[PDB]
Amino acid sequence: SEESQAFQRQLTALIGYDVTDVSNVHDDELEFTRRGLVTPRMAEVASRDPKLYAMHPWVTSKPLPEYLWKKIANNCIFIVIHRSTTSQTIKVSPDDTPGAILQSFFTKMQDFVLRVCGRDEYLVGETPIKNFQWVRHCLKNGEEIHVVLDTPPDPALDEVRKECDRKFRVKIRGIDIPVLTDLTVFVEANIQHGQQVLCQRRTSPKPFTEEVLWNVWLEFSIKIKDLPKGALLNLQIYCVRLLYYVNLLLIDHRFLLRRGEYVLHMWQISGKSFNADKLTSATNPDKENSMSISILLDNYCHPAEMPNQLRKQLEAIIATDPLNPLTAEDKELLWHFRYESLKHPKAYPKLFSSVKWGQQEIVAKTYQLLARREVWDQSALDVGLTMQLLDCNFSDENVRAIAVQKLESLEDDDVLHYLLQLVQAVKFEPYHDSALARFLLKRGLRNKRIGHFLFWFLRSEIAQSRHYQQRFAVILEAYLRGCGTAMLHDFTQQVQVIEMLQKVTLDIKSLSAEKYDVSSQVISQLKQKLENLQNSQLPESFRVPYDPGLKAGALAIEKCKVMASKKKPLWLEFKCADPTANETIGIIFKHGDDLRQDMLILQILRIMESIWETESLDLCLLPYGCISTGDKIGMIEIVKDATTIAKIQQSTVGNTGAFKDEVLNHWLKEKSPTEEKFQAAVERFVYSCAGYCVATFVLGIGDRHNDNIMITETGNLFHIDFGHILGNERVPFVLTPDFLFVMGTSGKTSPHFQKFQDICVKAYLALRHHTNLLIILFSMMLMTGMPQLTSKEDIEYIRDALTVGKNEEDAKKYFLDQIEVCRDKGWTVQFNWFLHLVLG
Numbered sequence: 061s062e063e064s065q066a067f068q069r070q071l072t073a074l075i076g077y078d079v080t081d082v083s084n085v086h087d088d089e090l091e092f093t094r095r096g097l098v099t100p101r102m103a104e105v106a107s108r109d110p111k112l113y114a115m116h117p118w119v120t121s122k123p124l125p126e127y128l129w130k131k132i133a134n135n136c137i138f139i140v141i142h143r144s145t146t147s148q149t150i151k152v153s154p155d156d157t158p159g160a161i162l163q164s165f166f167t168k169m170q171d172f173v174l175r176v177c178g179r180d181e182y183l184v185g186e187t188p189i190k191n192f193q194w195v196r197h198c199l200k201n202g203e204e205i206h207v208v209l210d211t212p213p214d215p216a217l218d219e220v221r222k223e224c225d226r227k228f229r230v231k232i233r234g235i236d237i238p239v240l241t242d243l244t245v246f247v248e249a250n251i252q253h254g255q256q257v258l259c260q261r262r263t264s265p266k267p268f269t270e271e272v273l274w275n276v277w278l279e280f281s282i283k284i285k286d287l288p289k290g291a292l293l294n295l296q297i298y299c300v301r302l303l304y305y306v307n308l309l310l311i312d313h314r315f316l317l318r319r320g321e322y323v324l325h326m327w328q329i330s331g332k333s334f335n336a337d338k339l340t341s342a343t344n345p346d347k348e349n350s351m352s353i354s355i356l357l358d359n360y361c362h363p364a365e366m367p368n369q370l371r372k373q374l375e376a377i378i379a380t381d382p383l384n385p386l387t388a389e390d391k392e393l394l395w396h397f398r399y400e401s402l403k404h405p406k407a408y409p410k411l412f413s414s415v416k417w418g419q420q421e422i423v424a425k426t427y428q429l430l431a432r433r434e435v436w437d438q439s440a441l442d443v444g445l446t447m448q449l450l451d452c453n454f455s456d457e458n459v460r461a462i463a464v465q466k467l468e469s470l471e472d473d474d475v476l477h478y479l480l481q482l483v484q485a486v487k488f489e490p491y492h493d494s495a496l497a498r499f500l501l502k503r504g505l506r507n508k509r510i511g512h513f514l515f516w517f518l519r520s521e522i523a524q525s526r527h528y529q530q531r532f533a534v535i536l537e538a539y540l541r542g543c544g545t546a547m548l549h550d551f552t553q554q555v556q557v558i559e560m561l562q563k564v565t566l567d568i569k570s571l572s573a574e575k576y577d578v579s580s581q582v583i584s585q586l587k588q589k590l591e592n593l594q595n596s597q598l599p600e601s602f603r604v605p606y607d608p609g610l611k612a613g614a615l616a617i618e619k620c621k622v623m624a625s626k627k628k629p630l631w632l633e634f635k636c637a638d639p640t641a642n643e644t645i646g647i648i649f650k651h652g653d654d655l656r657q658d659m660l661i662l663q664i665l666r667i668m669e670s671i672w673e674t675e676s677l678d679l680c681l682l683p684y685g686c687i688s689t690g691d692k693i694g695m696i697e698i699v700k701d702a703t704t705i706a707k708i709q710q711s712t713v714g715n716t717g718a719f720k721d722e723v724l725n726h727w728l729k730e731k732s733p734t735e736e737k738f739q740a741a742v743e744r745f746v747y748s749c750a751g752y753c754v755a756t757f758v759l760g761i762g763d764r765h766n767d768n769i770m771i772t773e774t775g776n777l778f779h780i781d782f783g784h785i786l787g788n789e790r791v792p793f794v795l796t797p798d799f800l801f802v803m804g805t806s807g808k809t810s811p812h813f814q815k816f817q818d819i820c821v822k823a824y825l826a827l828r829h830h831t832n833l834l835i836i837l838f839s840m841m842l843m844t845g846m847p848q849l850t851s852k853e854d855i856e857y858i859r860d861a862l863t864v865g866k867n868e869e870d871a872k873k874y875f876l877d878q879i880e881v882c883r884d885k886g887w888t889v890q891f892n893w894f895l896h897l898v899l900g
């Protein structure tokens with residue numbers, strides 16, 4: 061269809077990849093998935109309520125924080141309402157439905173609805189107004205709720221376009237590389253299931269040349285019948301170091317044994333190791349420069365009491381952390397007692413790791429074992445436990461499915477919290493179509509906020525990842541067909557803006573080189589280049605990718621500028637597109653840093669906050685919006701009235717930092733109109749400082765330069781630029797005499813310092829109860845998100861930091877000890893960091 065191809069071509073530009081391209085595939089798996097996702101899509105599009113979907117209400121079922129309910133006081137809430145005239149305030153009960161409030165507003169005066177001024181947000185459906193996330197946000201900021209009486213959006217804008225017992229063996233013919241001194245080479249063939257190697261065979265070393273021919277049958281111990289679904293054939297070339305690797309599913313999406321001739325273009329590695337890239341079933345799209353290996357496959361297949369002491373033995377095995385390796389005896393015990401182990405959900409990840417997947421009999425029993433789901437099905441949802449089963453350790457679709465089952469109950473605000481990690485978890489899936497993928501698809505189509513972030517998280521991987529881009533493109537294309545024409549329009553104009561600006565970002569960086577800072581000609585060029593973009597192409601308005609609630613209008617070209625960083629990032633400001641708002645929308649465009657890392661780190665910060673909320677703790681973290689738009693390129697939210705802690709020192713002392721503890725406090729008063737807001741700043745600081753002290757310490761990002769820490773004029777302090785630190789005289793975290801001086805302590809105790817410690821302890825202990833969740837989120841992040849090869853060692857930093865197994869008291873002191881390490885060297889580390897900046 062003429063108009064059907066233009067619609068597909070439209071999808072291609074939004075996706076950033078062409079899913080109609082079969083050039084890179086040795087089979088139909090991707091295409092089979094594109095069609096497979098057709099059903100679960102149209103099913104969700106038909107399920108969602110048009111009105112609620114159009115207004116995408118953002119709500120939470122979580123209990124109101126214990127500290128905030130105190131703010132409720134009289135049990136009355138002030139809510140302002142304006143249409144063109146009326147400023148009149150109406151007092152409503154916390155449990156009152158927005159609709160019932162209209163009936164109350166119709167009495168003082170329904171086809172009209174309540175919207176939030178300056179943003180696109182709607183209070184709608186039946187939920188208590190206390191359950192609306194945006195409302196809770198105003199309270200925490202000590203802000204009054206301002207709502208505009210408005211007409212509901214037309215749901216018609218959301219309409220979607222009409223739609224053998226023999227042993228296994230493989231013949232290695234040879235390898236070929238287009239181009240390159242007397243070296244040696246051999247191929248390694250592994251049969252892998254969930255990172256576990258079932259059988260291994262290597263060829264005989266042959267002289268390394270542009271072509272090497274073997275034609276040898278590599279025979280394996282494993283029988284064809286014993287091959288578990290999701291099993292990978294891992295082919296690896298060896299120089300004794302690994303050169304290239306490629307993967308082929310021995311059993312396809314159709315449950316068929318893979319058969320016939322295959323020529324696979326492999327991936328090249330980097331020598332100096334857990335990486336999600338090594339798992340990909342995708343062949344290298346570049347056939348020009350990539351090594352290839354030819355193989356042949358021909359196999360014909362059409363298809364009660366537990367002794368007290370041992371109980372104590374596995375219970376301890378169940379109780380150990382996710383990163384605790386299971387010994388041989390560990391697994392045998394778990395398995396023989398599996399029916400007992402099935403009563404403990406927390407033991408599942410370890411139990412299914414005790415399964416021998418290279419045996420059909422065992423796998424079958426494993427299914428008989430899953431046949432009784434009672435304990436698991438009825439158990440309270442545990443994310444850290446659920447996600448544990450979604451990682452690289454499990455290739456079995458049925459095992460992974462039970463995890464996806466639990467996720468079904470997360471609803472909306474929890475999905476957003478874990479959305480990023482879940483999207484990354486797709487890389488662990490053996491097949492393109494999967495329960496997890498279908499889960500993400502459905503949830504994205506059901507909610508616009510979840511769908512918006514789904515879009516960008518997928519585009520991020522599609523752009524900079526040649527390994528998973530094909531699978532993700534297929535998933536994104538699926539979503540784009542069900543999201544409606546309105547969103548398709550929003551994404552379109554968001555993508556245009558992003559492309560125009562990135563071009564400017566890179567063109568600006570190419571000048572001024574690495575150093576020498578900013579030329580007057582570089583300032584001018586940007587000013588001109590922007591007005592040239594504002595002239596024609598740039599959309600009159602666009603939705604802010606990291607905050608879809610925000611609609612950005614025309615640029616402020618006078619407010620824009622190039623930053624002093626050696627990476628010459630852009631500082632951009634847009635006028636608010638919504639007339640019901642003055643304050644501009646700040647955004648930073650940077651190249652040369654990998655913002656996928658920043659992205660992941662920031663998402664964990666938001667997760668730590670949620671944990672602290674249930675514990676009735678508000679640490680005032682400031683997880684600013686960050687979106688990776690491509691390779692070493694992306695956008696960053698600008699927190700208003702915020703400056704670096706380094707600039708505050710230079711504003712007083714001078715070029716190179718020397719002491720001056722008092723400077724910190726001096727700045728806070730200067731930026732405080734009234735001591736009332738100064739004492740409020742000190743309060744905001746002591747909490748925020750505590751938050752980032754505990755959070756950063758756990759993630760191992762605790763030790764940072766003075767220039768990577770910022771503070772708002774209102775006292776809120778927050779870290780930035782998490783990209784390099786994870787790969788690059790340590791200090792547990794940053795705690796400085798200048799920070800202490802604001803608390804009243806000098807290298808000695810103060811009322812605020814005691815407050816500080818009590819906060820840290822309560823915050824640090826509240827995380828340890830979640831220890832497993834943090835461990836798996838952390839390890840996953842390293843595997844999917846860290847280009848630098850993640851090892852068993854790096855992932856184990858968070859085990860020590862969280863003091864696993866240590867007494868809650870023993871841990872309480874352990875953290876109070878880390879604080880003591882800070883005062884021991886006050887400026888020592890920061891002074892070296894300042895010395896490290898020059899060299900070297």
Ligand SMILES: COc1ccc(Nc2cc(-c3cnc(N)nc3)nc(N3CCOCC3)n2)cc1OC
Nearest residue numbers: 624653658684696697698699702703704780781782
């Ligand atoms: C007031 O002075 C400055 C204020 C900020 C910066 N630089 C950066 C640098 C970065 C940054 C963030 N992420 C990464 N990867 N690299 C850099 N982010 C910000 N902001 C984001 C949060 O809201 C505040 C702004 N600012 C530099 C300054 O002087 C050189």
